[PDB]
Write a sequence for this structure.
């Protein structure tokens, strides 16, 4: 049952936070809350449509 | 109208690498605040704002043109002395003076990390409020959750902190601008 | 078809209302010797009908006054000693809402008796009068929630170019109509408020934006403010009393 | 579409939509908030009562 | 499309109500820089 | 469905099912335990006698 693994060794780099100055793409941080994905919709309570 | 105006004629790709047509994108970007020495560290809450001095976060600068905020906010933290630490939320009611109790004793959401391996702490603080809106620097809700962090053994340390708007976040109601300085200080 | 024992084994499933409020545990018996009628025919001139939502929307006087050349015009800029001290820009009149109305009008103060909470959306009306020869320019504008935030954030916003970018409306005397309308949407953290305490938010202000001038010195002109609620939504039943905030215990 | 956005693994795409621009002045306009809205995706589960809510 | 002389020859046929009572002799001008909305969603238990 | 749940690699989905709610009081109810049940997935192998059980 303990069959041999084969696969491939693969290269990597240890960069803890690749891009936080960027204005786009991925938070990374862990929310301090039950349920990994908190959310709410900002668009609903707004004083105006635009 | 009596316009002389004739509309432009210029390509977008020829001169700079990007273009942006909103202030939110500028705010999702994370910026430094102020160094937090000592044990009784105090990060700003989701009410945010009202810093003195003159150095201040970009979010903190955009903050003055508006009146309402809503949504979670993010933190990056870089400890000066490496070693593991813990992250926890709290509130003014939630605190105890038994002098044997400690911050772990409330069973709030928790986060551990050894900084020797991952120097950059990354924590997002959610949005628990009764109200759909929050006037900036509201004091109508005394018990809103507030962040705290501890090394065990309660030793002194400094931290380089930098905040950012969460993806969930927005501002609303446009008040007019604050007076603001622009150039480098003149003379000494 | 059964003798009614004095209080032994009454029906236990009965339920019925009397008034618009108040449920009741058992039915009154509709026995009596005669059923009489309304008697009088109306015989009258007709008049428009009265309604509660209609009554609440009635127009109300808010302020009235003279305006004249000697009064100060708002500053373009600020200096230090007034920048540190949270200086406020001078104005002919300022008006709190919605208290100027609800606690300000005995009529409305009475119509809202014994109701718990409510929403409102204001309208305001400025009406200025003076001679054709006069020169001037007013501004009517809405300072926001203001008081619920830091003292500093209601301080660095008071200067001309910011004043003119708030919601509001200008009034030149060149206009023949000489009157303006201004709408104020409801806005707060709480979704409702009881009318009869210090629920003070958004402070309307009126400011000179150009000094009054006439061929002679010390010309003057009159003005009046009026206002009315719309989109109202009353909610709940309660004794008519001042309410209390969180730290306080009742 | 955060699930797909993380599964696909590329930073750029960040879930496409096309907003309804209005109040154009000179070839530039203001998007409606109503159409900038993006799916939340846990709400469907809470309303439909998926088993995972109960931990089983 | 005509300059409004300060009070010379206003229209003389105008009539309109403001409140449920009170008729008024001339229309207020609906000019202002912005038109804002109700803000809050209700989020409450219903009552009669 | 732990195998697929780990292979797909995303935290959220955690194998969907739809429970049969009952005893609704005011728009809220109690799921049956019978329908919250989820597959175990080794049992099929032990009953069907797959080769891997014997190590070959």
């Amino acid at each position: 049952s303990k069959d041999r693994d084969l696969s491939k060794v693969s290269p990597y780099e240890n960069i803890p936070a690749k891009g936080f100055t960027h204005g786009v793409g991925f938070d990374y941080g862990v929310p301090l809350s039950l349920f990994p994905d908190n959310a709410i919709d900002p668009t609903i309570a707004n004083p105006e449509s635009i | 109208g009596m316009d002389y105006a004739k509309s432009d004629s210029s390509s977008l790709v020829t001169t700079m690498g990007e273009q942006f047509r909103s202030l939110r994108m500028l705010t999702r970007r994370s910026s430094p605040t102020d160094v937090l020495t000592g044990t009784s560290v105090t990060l700003p809450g989701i009410t945010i704002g009202t810093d003195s001095s003159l150095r201040q976060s970009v979010l903190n600068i955009i903050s003055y043109m508006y009146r309402f905020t809503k949504g979670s906010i993010s933190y990056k933290i870089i400890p000066k002395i490496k070693g593991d630490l813990y992250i926890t939320t709290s509130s003014a009611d939630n605190i105890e003076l038994n002098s044997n109790a400690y911050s772990f004793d409330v069973n709030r959401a928790l986060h551990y990390q050894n900084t020797a391996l991952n120097p950059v702490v990354q924590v997002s603080l959610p949005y628990y409020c009764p109200s759909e809106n929050l006037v900036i620097d509201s004091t109508s809700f005394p018990n809103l959750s507030n962040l705290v962090l501890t090394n065990l053994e309660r030793s002194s340390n400094t931290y380089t902190v930098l905040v950012s708007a969460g993806d969930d976040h927005t501002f609303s109601q446009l008040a007019g601008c604050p007076a603001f300085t622009i150039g480098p200080s003149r003379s000494a | 078809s059964v003798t009614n024992t004095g209080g032994l084994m009454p029906s236990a499933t009965i339920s019925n209302s009397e008034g618009a409020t108040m449920l009741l545990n058992d039915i009154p018996d509709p026995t009596q010797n005669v059923f009489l009628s309304r008697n009088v025919t109306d015989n009258l001139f007709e008049v428009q009908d009265q309604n509660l939502i209609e009554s609440l929307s009635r127009e109300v006087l808010l302020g009235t006054g003279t305006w004249q050349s000697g009064q100060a015009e708002i500053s373009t800029t600020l200096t230090e000693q007034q920048l540190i001290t949270n200086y406020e820009q001078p104005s002919i009149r300022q008006i709190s809402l919605p208290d100027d109305i609800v606690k300000g009008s005995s009529f409305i103060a009475s119509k809202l008796a014994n109701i718990a909470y409510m929403r409102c959306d204001y309208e305001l009306y400025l009406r200025v009068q003076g001679s054709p020869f006069l020169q001037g320019l007013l501004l009517l504008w809405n300072k926001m929630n203001a008081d619920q935030t830091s003292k500093i954030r209601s301080s660095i916003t008071e200067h001309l170019r910011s004043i003119t970018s708030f919601p509001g409306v200008t009034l030149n005397m060149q206009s023949d109509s000489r009157s303006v309308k201004l709408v104020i949407p409801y806005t707060s953290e709480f979704q409702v408020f009881n009318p009869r305490n210090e629920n003070k938010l958004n402070s309307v202000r009126l400011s000179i934006l150009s000094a009054l001038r006439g061929p002679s010195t010390s010309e003057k002109a009159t003005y009046s403010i009026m206002g009315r609620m719309t989109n109202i939504k009353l909610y709940g039943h309660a004794p008519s009393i001042v309410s209390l905030s969180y730290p306080q215990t009742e | 579409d955060d699930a797909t956005a993380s599964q696909r693994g590329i930073v750029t795409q960040v879930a496409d939509t096309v907003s309804s621009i209005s109040n154009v002045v000179d070839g530039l306009g203001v998007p409606l908030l109503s159409s900038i809205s993006k799916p939340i995706g846990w709400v469907s589960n809470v309303v439909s009562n998926v088993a995972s809510i109960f931990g089983f």
The radius of gyration of chain A is 21 Å. The first strand of chain A starts at residue 30 and ends at 31.
